[PDB]
Amino acid sequence: ELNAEIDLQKTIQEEYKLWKQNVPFLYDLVITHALEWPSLTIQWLPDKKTIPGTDYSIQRLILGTHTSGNDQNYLQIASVQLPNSYTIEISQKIPHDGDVNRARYMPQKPEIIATMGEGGNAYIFDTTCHDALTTGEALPQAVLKGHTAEGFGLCWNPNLPGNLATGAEDQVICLWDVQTQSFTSSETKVISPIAKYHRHTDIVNDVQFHPQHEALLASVSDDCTLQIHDTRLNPEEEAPKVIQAHSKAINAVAINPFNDYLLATASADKTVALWDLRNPYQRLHTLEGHEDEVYGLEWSPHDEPILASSSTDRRVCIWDLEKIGEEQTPEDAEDGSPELLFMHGGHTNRISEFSWCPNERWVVGSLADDNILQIWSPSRVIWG
């Protein structure tokens, strides 16, 4: 429909202009970078470099490309200045087979990066074994051969070095043991799964290991279930918990890094549901505020009650669970429920991914399909 497209372009233009006008009363920080190629994935690397005698530091982000088969794809590392504000630079490009659907660094060895790539292969790169800019086609340290179709689920086990979980559109979850010692710069190793789960009946959208329990894996799917897997058990059995969490597709799961029982799901039904693992079959609460499918989900690494979500409504929302149930005035209620702390409306296309900065409080990096990287911080008046 042409009229729909005309209206969408007009409303995005008007909303952006209204957003820019109110930025000074919303943010302590907004940095905008136009990327040469759009990225489906983003993750802060864990290192921070103070520049002494200066009011900034240097931090780094993992990006990828998705040319869609035209040109060479790349895993990239961007260096960004942050106030203790201005520049970005791609400090490393590593050739990559196909779209970078997701990229994640190994928590115990940040120079190792796993990706989800061409036709379902996952890839391992040791970025210290690659130059800053390389001529040819991809030469990964390892290809993980297992999925038969492209995928977006990818998570390292933070309590078992080299243990990786993937999930893809073939409805399969793979578990892997990546041993970096066998790597060389010469040739690509072939790794195959140590276990496969066939526990979903539709695309597997997200997997995540429990941060404090090495054998607990959570997964969510287009089949509308949230499942909790015990990784020590018979892979052919049913998962210990199958939860009918939403009535529409579930795109993301996120386990709270402070409260071991608290878990969030994000769904095409426009909501985020909260779950307690000790009564997993009815939800604790529904976070309502998005106007379209919710895709991205990440707990704050610094504050137990703070959750961020992103949506095809082009907003990133920050939720403060301590404000649940709090009395509102009618004029305040016009903005939505009280637990909706902050809305970031600076993007102008669909949000691909976002990531909380681990070295700065209240800093998010978020990407949209129109090549825009934004690094922002809501005003301390709002969150203090």
Binding site: T11, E15, Y16, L18, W19, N22, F25, L26, E291, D313, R315, E331, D332, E334, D335, G336, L340, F342, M343, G345, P378, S379, V381, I382
Partner: peptide
Amino acid sequence: NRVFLRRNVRAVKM
């Protein structure tokens, strides 16, 4: 369709 929360601006402006 809110692009920001007005109560946020009210909090920051004053």
